[PDB]
Amino acid sequence: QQVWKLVIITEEILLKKVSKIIKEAGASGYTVLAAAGEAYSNIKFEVLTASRELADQIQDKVVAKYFDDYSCITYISTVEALRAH
Amino acid sequence: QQVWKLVIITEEILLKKVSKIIKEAGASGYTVLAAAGEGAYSNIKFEVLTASRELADQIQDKVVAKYFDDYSCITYISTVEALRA
Amino acid sequence: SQQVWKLVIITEEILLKKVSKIIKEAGASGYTVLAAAGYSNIKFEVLTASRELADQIQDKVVAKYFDDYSCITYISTVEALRAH
């Protein structure tokens, strides 16, 4: 089983709106960590998706909607051996 | 020749018990990060770097067999290059 | 379509500014810093459009420290990068 990991790094304030985007898309497990750019006023999302299309779907939505007016970093990579509960 | 990274995302309460499995299997070294997760940061993220896929598989089966049914737990594996430690 | 390298440096908190300046001076866009535990460490994630640039930052860092500071570092690749 190949799984995709979508990282979104944005500003703390966007925690609730970006979480909501993630759920309403139907994610299978997302994690958040606190982070600092160049104070831990940023947050890092890690969203695991069964298809590259859903990862692309969530990335497109967050970019189109917040990429311009907020500091944002997003990227995708593949992972193996997902066991999730 | 190949380094593998094993991620275990689980409840903060298993920090000692998961740390024990990781140590008793004799890994290249690990880091733990506070985190929060859904479908405050009450979870922990282990990143375990192993010299072989088999060792990573072995730490992972164990954790899974022991704690997966009863605790929120996410785990998966991927490859890294250029490891200095 | 767009292959990108991600350098991870996990090191003692005491070296924040030092390695931050190595990452700066080496010309990389920026980075992310996460607090971690080994006790208390920082984890840098640096994105480079060139594998070249990742290994320079790696070289200088492990050159100076590593031999008398706790240090883990490694590289991998990501794709579909967007940044602002």
Side-chain angles (χ1 to χ4, degrees):
Chain A
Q1 189 196 40
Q2 166 146 303
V3 180
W4 282 268
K5 188 158 91 161
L6 161 70
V7 166
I8 315 156
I9 301 167
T10 59
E11 295 162 50
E12 232 173 344
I13 186 72
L14 288 184
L15 171 69
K16 299 135 266 268
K17 286 284 204 307
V18 165
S19 292
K20 158 270 301 162
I21 290 190
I22 282 156
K23 319 178 159 132
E24 286 163 11
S28 71
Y30 83 81
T31 312
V32 182
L33 311 99
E38 71 278 36
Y40 292 101
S41 51
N42 293 329
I43 52 178
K44 167 152 157 189
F45 285 88
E46 287 178 344
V47 196
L48 295 163
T49 73
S51 68
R52 171 63 180 275
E53 191 62 16
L54 177 65
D56 284 350
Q57 171 183 308
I58 293 179
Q59 206 194 26
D60 291 342
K61 184 163 179 199
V62 158
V63 158
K65 174 146 213 177
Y66 301 111
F67 192 64
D68 288 329
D69 297 32
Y70 295 82
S71 92
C72 160
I73 300 181
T74 182
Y75 53 84
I76 283 154
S77 59
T78 57
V79 90
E80 303 183 36
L82 173 63
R83 266 304 84 219
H85 166 273
Chain B
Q1 161 44 30
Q2 186 102 76
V3 190
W4 297 78
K5 185 160 72 113
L6 166 66
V7 173
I8 299 169
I9 296 162
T10 201
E11 305 185 13
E12 178 186 7
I13 304 89
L14 312 175
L15 160 70
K16 297 201 72 162
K17 305 187 197 174
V18 162
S19 288
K20 181 149 80 87
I21 308 178
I22 295 162
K23 294 202 225 88
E24 270 151 10
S28 295
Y30 72 96
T31 86
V32 180
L33 298 102
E38 293 177 350
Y41 301 67
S42 59
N43 294 325
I44 48 185
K45 175 195 206 181
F46 294 86
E47 297 190 297
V48 187
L49 283 299
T50 69
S52 58
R53 173 61 175 261
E54 242 296 313
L55 180 56
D57 291 344
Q58 281 197 8
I59 295 144
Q60 174 171 254
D61 309 333
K62 199 46 181 178
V63 174
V64 167
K66 251 170 150 167
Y67 305 112
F68 189 77
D69 308 321
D70 300 328
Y71 304 76
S72 295
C73 155
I74 289 163
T75 184
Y76 56 81
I77 295 180
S78 61
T79 46
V80 304
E81 278 56 36
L83 164 66
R84 305 334 155 196
Chain C
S1 47
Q2 312 176 307
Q3 175 143 268
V4 183
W5 280 268
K6 169 162 121 166
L7 168 63
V8 168
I9 304 141
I10 306 176
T11 206
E12 264 163 341
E13 163 163 30
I14 312 90
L15 316 167
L16 177 61
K17 286 75 24 170
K18 263 311 331 231
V19 174
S20 64
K21 150 170 44 60
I22 296 185
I23 298 166
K24 286 309 234 209
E25 291 220 78
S29 320
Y31 49 103
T32 312
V33 189
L34 301 109
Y39 311 156
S40 152
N41 315 68
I42 48 179
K43 171 181 167 195
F44 299 83
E45 314 189 296
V46 190
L47 301 178
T48 61
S50 94
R51 170 65 178 257
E52 307 73 344
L53 178 50
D55 299 272
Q56 337 194 33
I57 307 165
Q58 192 162 72
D59 290 333
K60 234 69 184 76
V61 164
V62 52
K64 320 198 164 186
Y65 323 104
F66 182 97
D67 296 289
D68 41 330
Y69 285 112
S70 65
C71 185
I72 302 186
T73 170
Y74 57 79
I75 306 179
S76 70
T77 64
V78 300
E79 67 190 70
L81 173 48
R82 294 188 210 179
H84 176 101

